[PDB]
Every structure is written in structure tokens, then in C-alpha cells.
């Protein structure tokens, strides 16, 4: 269930509410400002890191479940999504239907959105690929 959720369900949740469109009305007292701006923020592919921890001084290193159990940390990994910013503008002529165009500010760009706790021995955890000797090296019970 956790491997299904990480591999497939996370992207499905991201893609369900991916596009966030904001339309700014012209609010033009004079006809010199007859432009309407349409700003769109769209989430793309989601990325997940290996389990890791950021400490007080900002250093981020790989976190193993033995250390996370001892140091009372959370065995979690970062989630990164691709965000593309779309900027659409059109001439606000009343009566005429607005036809938006890009101003070529299509900036895109992984952004950190949070830490997903990783269930042990799942595909994201370090212990999945570990052999018995590797588990003994990490002080984990095989």
C-alpha cells in the first residue's frame, strides 16, 4: 500500500489540483489601462528524495532509521514538485471576448513542498536494498 501510494497516488493527488489560475481584472478608470492579467501556477511532476534530515545549522544528510530512533527524529523524505508559472494578458475590450497570450515569462524548478514519512523497508527506505550484512552494518535487525 505504501509503495503504491508513493509511486502512483502522490502524482495523482498533485495532478488533480495541479493548475491554479488567478485572473486580475483591469479595473480601468481610463482606457489606457485596458489590460487583464491571468496568472497561472501549475504543478508538474513530483519528486521524492531518499530519507534525510535537516538539522539546526542547516546541514542536510542521509537519515537512517537507527539514528532516527535514537535521536527522536522522523524518518521522512522530501517531496519536490515542478512548478511552471504562466503569465497571460489580454486587451480588456468590453463586449469582445478576451484572448489571452503569454508574455514569455514561463519560468520553471523543483520546489520543496514537505516531508513525507517513509515506512521502513518500502521502496524509498534505505533498508529495502540492504543485504543482511548491510542491515547488520546499519545496526538493524535482519
Amino acid at each position: 500500500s505504501f509503495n503504491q501510494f508513493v509511486d502512483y497516488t502522490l502524482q495523482d493527488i498533485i495532478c488533480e489540483d495541479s493548475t491554479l489560475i488567478l485572473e486580475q481584472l483591469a479595473q480601468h478608470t481610463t482606457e489606457s489601462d485596458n489590460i487583464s492579467r491571468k496568472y497561472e501556477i501549475s504543478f508538474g511532476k513530483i519528486y521524492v528524495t531518499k530519507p534525510m534530515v535537516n538539522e539546526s545549522d542547516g546541514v542536510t544528510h542521509a537519515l537512517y532509521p537507527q539514528e532516527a530512533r535514537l535521536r527522536n527524529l522522523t524518518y521522512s523524505s522530501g517531496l519536490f514538485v515542478d512548478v511552471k508559472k504562466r503569465t497571460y494578458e489580454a486587451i480588456d475590450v468590453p463586449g469582445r471576448e478576451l484572448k489571452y497570450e503569454l508574455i514569455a515569462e514561463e519560468s520553471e524548478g523543483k520546489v520543496f513542498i514537505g516531508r513525507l514519512p517513509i515506512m521502513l523497508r518500502s521502496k524509498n527506505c534505505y533498508l529495502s536494498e540492504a543485504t543482511e550484512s548491510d542491515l547488520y552494518k546499519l545496526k538493524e535487525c535482519p
Binding site: 493548475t19 489560475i21 488567478l22 486580475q24 481584472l25 479595473q27 491571468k38 497561472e40
Partner: peptide, 11 residues
Amino acid sequence: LRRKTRQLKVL
């Protein structure tokens, strides 16, 4: 007086 900005439900 008119609302400057609004949410557009993408479809």
C-alpha cells in the same frame, strides 16, 4: 468597487 482578482476553476 469591482473585485480586482478572482479564482478561475480550470476545466
